[PDB]
Amino acid sequence: SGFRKMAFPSGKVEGCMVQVTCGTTTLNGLWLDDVVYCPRHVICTSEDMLNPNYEDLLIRKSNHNFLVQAGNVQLRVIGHSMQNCVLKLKVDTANPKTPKYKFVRIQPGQTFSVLACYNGSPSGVYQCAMRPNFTIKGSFLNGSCGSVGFNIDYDCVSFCYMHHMELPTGVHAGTDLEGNFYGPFVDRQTAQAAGTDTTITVNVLAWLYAAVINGDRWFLNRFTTTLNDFNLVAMKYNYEPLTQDHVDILGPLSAQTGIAVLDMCASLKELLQNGMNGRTILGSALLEDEFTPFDVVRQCS
Amino acid sequence: SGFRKMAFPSGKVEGCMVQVTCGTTTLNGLWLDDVVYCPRHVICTSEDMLNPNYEDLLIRKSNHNFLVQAGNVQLRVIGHSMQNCVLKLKVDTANPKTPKYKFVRIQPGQTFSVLACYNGSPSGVYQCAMRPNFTIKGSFLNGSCGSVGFNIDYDCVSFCYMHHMELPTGVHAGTDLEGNFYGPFVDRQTAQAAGTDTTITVNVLAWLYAAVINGDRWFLNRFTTTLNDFNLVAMKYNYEPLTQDHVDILGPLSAQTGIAVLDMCASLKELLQNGMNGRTILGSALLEDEFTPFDVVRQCSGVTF
Ligand SMILES: CC(C)(C)c1ccc(N(C(=O)c2c[nH]cn2)[C@@H](C(=O)NC2CCCCC2)c2cccnc2)cc1
Ligand SMILES: CC(C)(C)c1ccc(N(C(=O)c2c[nH]cn2)[C@@H](C(=O)NC2CCCCC2)c2cccnc2)cc1
Ligand SMILES: [Cl-]
Ligand SMILES: [Cl-]
Ligand code: NA
């Protein structure tokens, strides 16, 4: 019993975190086999953050311009290349702590764990979601760049996010491990801003199912809804559309609880209309949207 | 910027988790040096559950009654004893991954990270607080017993909690690593219930400071208060008394934000008496009390381990 924001154990990632220094700039890198991955903006100069040309900046670098430190050991850079917005530093030693891993690009609504690091050293671990507007609502300070997001279903680390920058509302933008940004963001100082965000509806429904599994039914009602009427209402509260794919994904939790997916939709419609009237759901006074259906099944098992 | 519920990195603890089996019961153990720690209730049968004589049950046990598995390797048990409600199994191999560590007993209101484990395998990590009623609001399923809670200081793991059991409301009870229960609970199947809980005042103030640091200011006001007046309000709303030591502990955040602990106390007093008026603080519509002052300082300053 109980229901918590739960991250994956971070040890397999901790063993991959290094410090990368170029000039006066220091940030984090991810050391897998003989490669260190980091944001290419480590080579951006202080004097021109507005319109860097990374191809031209990188061709000017020697291997010895990159200082990589793994705990107390200097690692020797022996080659470098850029892939999209990620820099790949080849080093002369493979990380003996490299876990089983893969790179995955995730969709909005997906959750992952973040290991926040500074100077190559871990600070803490928390759970995030890729928001519909392709930001994450992280907790990241100056120098957190290069920290990564990951999942560890079935002993394989799936790296899905590398942190690059902070946007003006204090939310965060980054890339997959192939260096492609999530969303329309770019790695330079521009006026770019996050779009209006919206609530991840399928996740709210999953969390209501978690509440029922945990023994709380107060928010249910006697009604149902069509999928289209639900979306017409939910969008007036800046909720994302619920698709038939989402309805299918919720099938298992519906089956476990006995509550049809569209009956749970009717409950959510009523909660948006009424609020919680001084009550809570799984200890929260707002509707939570950073647990996926998969997360709920994993944690409630 | 941003502010999240944040756990300590769990790697040093993951390397200590093993599976412990006695009879038909499996749960988790903590392998440090050449000793495995786990709940003594591992030796209870379903008959013994109601009124176990742990002295007699242990005497009846021998070393081979305990199977210890570190991943796929069996650890040979070469001795066994009990300390309070914790069983200690001596094994023939020191854990090569043992971190620098201490056993620490924490106070109500203090937070810690939990590494939830099943069958000796780490499954997830979360942050929680020791409630004033000495329960924890954990997330634990059958077989989670022996999962541990911890803090890290530099390179040193302070183990503070071992999970033992679930109470009827779905909250959790356990011990320190010397086997002393937190709270008035016993490791047997009997009538036991969490007492009425209160809110951890110093932690709410810390979280209000975190909110100010992150630009959430609507709840600040011109007023200040005194400890005595505030504590009369706290008692009314089932908040823990605020002591002068709490004020001193917040001193930093007080000096940094420009809001004195008694000035912030005036914000909290008004929030208790009037509510939030439809607004949120740091993404919450409730007053959050599971961040300590130290948690806020570490997250807002980026302390590493
Ligand atoms: C060169 C480029 C792309 C413009 C850049 C510059 C600085 C950083 N930030 C580094 O902290 C940082 C950079 N290198 C080492 N640290 C921070 C950051 O985004 N501030 C932004 C301030 C507004 C203008 C864009 C940059 C940062 C803060 C908190 C959390 N995350 C990151 C990131 C990117
Ligand atoms: C022997 C004793 C002390 C009565 C006991 C029995 C069972 C367990 N529980 C084990 O799951 C368990 C035990 N051994 C292996 N697994 C669970 C547990 O507390 N149910 C309680 C139900 C009321 C009466 C028994 C206790 C459990 C579930 C979820 C989270 N936490 C723990 C704990 C303690
Ligand atoms: Cl995905
Ligand atoms: Cl006894
Ligand atoms: Na005030």
UniProtKB/Swiss-Prot annotation, chain B:
**Result, substituting C145A:** Complete loss of 3C-like proteinase nsp5 cleavage
Residue ranges that the UniProt entry lists as topological domain Cytoplasmic: 1-305
Q: Which domain of life is it from?
A: Viruses
Reported effect of changing Q189A? Does not affect ability to cleave and inactivate human TRMT1
Cite the active-site annotation.
H41, C145
Q: Where in the cell is it found?
A: Host cytoplasm; Host Golgi apparatus; Host nucleus
Reaction(s) catalysed (UniProt annotation):
TSAVLQ-|-SGFRK-NH2 and SGVTFQ-|-GKFKK the two peptides corresponding to the two self-cleavage sites of the SARS 3C-like proteinase are the two most reactive peptide substrates. The enzyme exhibits a strong preference for substrates containing Gln at P1 position and Leu at P2 position
Activity regulation here? Inhibited by pyridone-containing alpha-ketoamides compounds 13a and 13b. In turn, alpha-ketoamide 13b (tert-butyl (1-((S)-1-(((S)-4-(benzylamino)-3,4-dioxo-1-((S)-2-oxopyrrolidin-3-yl)butan-2-yl)amino)-3-cyclopropyl-1-oxopropan-2-yl)-2-oxo-1,2-dihydropyridin-3-yl)carbamate) inhibits SARS-CoV-2 replication in human lung cells. Inhibited ex vivo by michael acceptor inhibitor N3. Inhibited ex vivo by compound 11a and 11b.
Q: Which residues form a coiled coil?
A: none
Q: How does it assemble?
A: 3CL-PRO exists as monomer and homodimer. Only the homodimer shows catalytic activity. Interacts with host FBXO22; this interaction promotes the proteasomal degradation of nsp5.
Provide the protein name: 3C-like proteinase nsp5
- Which organism encodes this protein? Severe acute respiratory syndrome coronavirus 2 (2019-nCoV)
Q: Which gene encodes it?
A: rep
